[PDB]
Amino acid sequence: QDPLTINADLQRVAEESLNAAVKRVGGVWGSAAVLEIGTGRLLALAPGGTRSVSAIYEPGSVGKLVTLAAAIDQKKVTPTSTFTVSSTRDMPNGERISDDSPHETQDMTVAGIIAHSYNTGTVQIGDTVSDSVRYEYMQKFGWGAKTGITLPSEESGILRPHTEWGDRDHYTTMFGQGVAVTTIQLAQMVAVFGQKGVLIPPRIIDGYDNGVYTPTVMGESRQVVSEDTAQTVLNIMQGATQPGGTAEGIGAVKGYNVAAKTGTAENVGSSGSLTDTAATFTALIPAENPKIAVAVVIYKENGTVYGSTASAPVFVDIAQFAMREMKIPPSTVPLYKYPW
Numbered sequence: 105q106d107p108l109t110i111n112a113d114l115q116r117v118a119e120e121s122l123n124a125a126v127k128r129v130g131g132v133w134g135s136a137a138v139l140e141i142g143t144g145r146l147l148a149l150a151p152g153g154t155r156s157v158s159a160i161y162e163p164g165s166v167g168k169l170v171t172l173a174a175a176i177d178q179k180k181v182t183p184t185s186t187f188t189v190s191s192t193r194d195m196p197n198g199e200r201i202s203d204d205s206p207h208e209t210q211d212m213t214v215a216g217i218i219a220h221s222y223n224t225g226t227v228q229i230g231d232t233v234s235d236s237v238r239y240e241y242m243q244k245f246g247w248g249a250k251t252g253i254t255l256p257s258e259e260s261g262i263l264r265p266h267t268e269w270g271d272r273d274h275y276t277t278m279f280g281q282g283v284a285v286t287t288i289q290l291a292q293m294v295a296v297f298g299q300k301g302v303l304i305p306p307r308i309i310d311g312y313d314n315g316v317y318t319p320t321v322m323g324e325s326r327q328v329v330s331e332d333t334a335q336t337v338l339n340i341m342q343g344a345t346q347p348g349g350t351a352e353g354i355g356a357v358k359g360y361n362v363a364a365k366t367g368t369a370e371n372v373g374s375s376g377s378l379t380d381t382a383a384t385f386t387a388l389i390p391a392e393n394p395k396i397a398v399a400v401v402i403y404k405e406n407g408t409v410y411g412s413t414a415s416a417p418v419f420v421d422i423a424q425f426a427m428r429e430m431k432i433p434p435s436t437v438p439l440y441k442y443p444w
């Protein structure tokens with residue numbers, strides 16, 4: 105009978121987790137999308153209606169995965185390249201970049217920089233490639249374009265052409281500021297790293313109706329980064345739940361290796377200035393062999409919510425249930441760790 109991809113139990117878990125989290129942190133709304141790795145199949149989409157495809161926001165640090173993937177794919181850095189991180193860094197073009205949390209100046213590998221989500225390390229990674237090349241990766245990752253899912257009212261998001269970027273834009277676009285995305289776009293993006301560098305268009309329709317039940321096909325996929333890059337990003341993402349990672353404890357799924365990135369993104373409020381926050385979380389599980397990709401956002405007006413405390417618990421509840429329901433055996437290999 106059923107022509108849609110939505111898993112009804114998973115959908116209930118999603119909605120329940122999402123509602124509870126929005127209320128828990130005093131948010132105004134939230135969204136979550138779960139994609140099946142390798143197929144484009146949408147297993148859950150919360151809330152009901154079109155929010156997950158029509159609400160745009162600056163995603164913050166989850167956007168660092170695009171910057172990182174570009175620099176790795178262009179063979180400009182490795183996971184063990186070292187950069188100095190610090191509270192602030194004055195850049196060649198005169199911009200000051202801050203980490204938004206004071207901390208000791210120290211040297212750290214690319215892997216540690218991403219696990220810790222340090223902006224001062226991230227902008228130096230981004231500076232190893234040209235803006236036109238970065239911008240091209242952004243497009244390939246699906247930003248600035250509708251995903252094509254058969255739901256109404258989908259937004260393309262906002263990706264200004266790189267030729268238009270000023271000194272500040274050059275940097276803010278490396279960590280998900282000055283760009284706007286949908287939740288569905290964030291899920292499509294992260295799945296790439298569990299799909300050998302391939303992006304697969306998301307679908308909600310499994311197949312319609314002689315009047316025969318003919319299933320829908322996978323849709324035109326595209327190589328975004330190489331298989332090696334995808335695997336390296338997937339390894340780096342496993343740093344999130346390790347000691348020192350931004351998702352330590354709170355993003356852990358008992359028995360399963362998690363690959364994730366958090367975000368705490370400033371957003372323009374009702375009265376013009378940067379008063380709002382989107383807490384973002386993008387993850388793949390099990391990390392050694394991803395079966396689902398998840399993106400969660402919780403949006404708050406006139407306050408700060410953190411990717412980790414607002415949105416990670418939504419992913420955890422979703423992910424615990426999905427693994428059991430999909431009969432995925434617990435991880436038998438260690439969580440990946442690069443030296444930091």
Ligand SMILES: C[C@@H](O)[C@@H](C=O)[C@@H]1NC(C(=O)O)=C(S[C@@H]2CN[C@H](C(=O)N(C)C)C2)[C@@H]1C
Pocket residue numbers: 163164165166203204205220221222223279281350365366367368369410411412
């Ligand atoms: C645009 C960037 O400034 C932020 C990206 O979203 C940083 N990334 C995160 C994050 O949620 O991962 C936090 S806040 C979080 C809460 N404490 C940590 C922190 O303050 N760091 C790592 C600087 C991390 C940054 C502001």
